[PDB]
């Protein structure tokens, strides 16, 4: 058992932040002990629970007698397809939400891959660390800025809904927990030639952050390893980008840079 | 019994007095500490310098192998 939140107050506040109403639908990831599930199911039209824990599921399953919307599906969210779930279990409520209070070493890759899964859902609200929360919801020219902020910029505009004290968690974490909201955008924030190529670019830029954009792109890029001799024209193709870094630049800057990269 | 005890009269800056120099090295080609040699630090320091110099000349072993289990 990980650090489990025991406060009804902050749980009520978070489930309010989730806007769990009659129309609103809920996806449960790692139902666990079943406090979040308790506060969600009563106000949700249909709750679908995904978990791979052996015994953390069927014990909770006993308590799910008063709830009629608890369609618990025993599987790993990463391994198992979720596309079918939209058709099968959201016939009751087309609106989609994902809520999680899990440990973060499992939570963050789950969120990343879910966004990679390309399932069109309205939004997601998850529980994460303060540092990673800053990392996701970041502005240009910040120490808390990086590739993760760039990645989440395509999908959503984020803000920590309500900072959480460490006390509420049973064992106490040393670092403060901060719950963020991720509400999916209409589409891509800024257009690009290739999505994968864009991601490769952003990885290359922020690989050795401290170095200049030029020094990053010289050594980081694999195709850059190919065209090391050719990086002259790469310098040429730069527009209004002088002696610069990654963190300095913004989403539109990197998008234009990628669009230029395809033309090289 | 200190190594100094089982010796007579000699010079330390003489980096060619090889026969006396083998005495100050252990069963392994290591320089014995002051506890075993029985010299003052100044003497120990100058002797270590001379020993290293002779090692460079190849008159003395940098390391050896010990006949024991």
């Amino acid at each position: 058992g990980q650090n489990f939140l025991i406060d009804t107050n902050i749980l009520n506040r978070i489930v309010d932040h989730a806007e769990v109403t009659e129309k609103t639908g809920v996806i449960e990831i790692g139902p666990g002990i079943g406090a979040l599930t308790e506060q969600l199911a009563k106000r949700a039209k249909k709750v679908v629970a995904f978990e791979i824990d052996q015994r953390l599921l069927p014990i909770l399953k006993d308590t799910l007698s008063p709830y009629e919307n608890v369609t618990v599906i025993h599987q790993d969210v990463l391994k198992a397809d979720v596309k079918s779930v939209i058709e099968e279990q959201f016939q009751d409520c087309d609106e989609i939400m994902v809520v999680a209070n899990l440990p973060y070493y499992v939570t963050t890759p789950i969120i990343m891959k879910l966004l990679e899964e390309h399932l069109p859902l309205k939004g997601i609200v998850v529980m994460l660390q303060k540092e990673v929360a800053e990392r996701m919801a970041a502005d240009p020219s910040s120490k808390e800025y990086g590739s993760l902020s760039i990645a989440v910029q395509f999908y959503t505009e984020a803000k920590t809904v309500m900072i959480v004290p460490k006390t509420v968690f049973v064992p106490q974490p040393n670092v403060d927990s901060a719950v963020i909201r991720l509400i999916l955008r209409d589409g891509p924030a800024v257009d690009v030639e290739n999505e994968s190529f864009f991601f490769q670019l952003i990885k290359a830029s922020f690989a050795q952050r401290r170095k200049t954009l030029l020094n990053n792109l010289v050594n980081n890029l694999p195709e850059g390893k190919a065209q090391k001799s050719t990086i002259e024209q790469v310098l040429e193709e730069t527009n209004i980008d002088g002696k610069r870094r990654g963190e300095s630049l913004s989403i539109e800057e990197f998008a234009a840079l990628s669009n230029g990269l395809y033309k090289a | 019994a200190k190594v100094k005890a089982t010796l007579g009269e000699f010079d330390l800056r003489d980096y060619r007095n090889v026969e006396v120099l083998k005495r100050f090295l252990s069963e392994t080609g290591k320089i014995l500490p002051r506890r075993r040699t029985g010299l003052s630090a100044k003497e120990q320091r100058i002797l270590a310098k001379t020993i290293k110099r002779a090692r460079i000349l190849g008159l003395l072993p940098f390391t050896e192998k010990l006949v024991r289990k």
């Binding site: - | 100094k4 010079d11 800056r13 003489d14 010299l39 003497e43 110099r53 000349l57 190849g58 072993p61």
Partner: protein, 101 residues
Amino acid sequence: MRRYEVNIVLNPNLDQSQLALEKEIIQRALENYGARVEKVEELGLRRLAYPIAKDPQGYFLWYQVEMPEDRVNDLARELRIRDNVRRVMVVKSQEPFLANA
């Protein structure tokens, strides 16, 4: 014009001819670099605790010289060019500091 000692260790696997020519050439270099030898000690063959240049044996030669200080490096680099010599170590002449007098 300080007093230095010069050490040359060279190939033992040489007869009188190569030995003599090496001696004369190194003496030529010595007198070339503004040096002035006083005394020469010849040590012949000595066993080495470790093999140098794939050879467990070595031939030894000893000089003490008073010569210009600025040119000792030049002499050391000169004597080391030949493949017949293994180690050349020039050290300053040190006073016999005795023990337990």
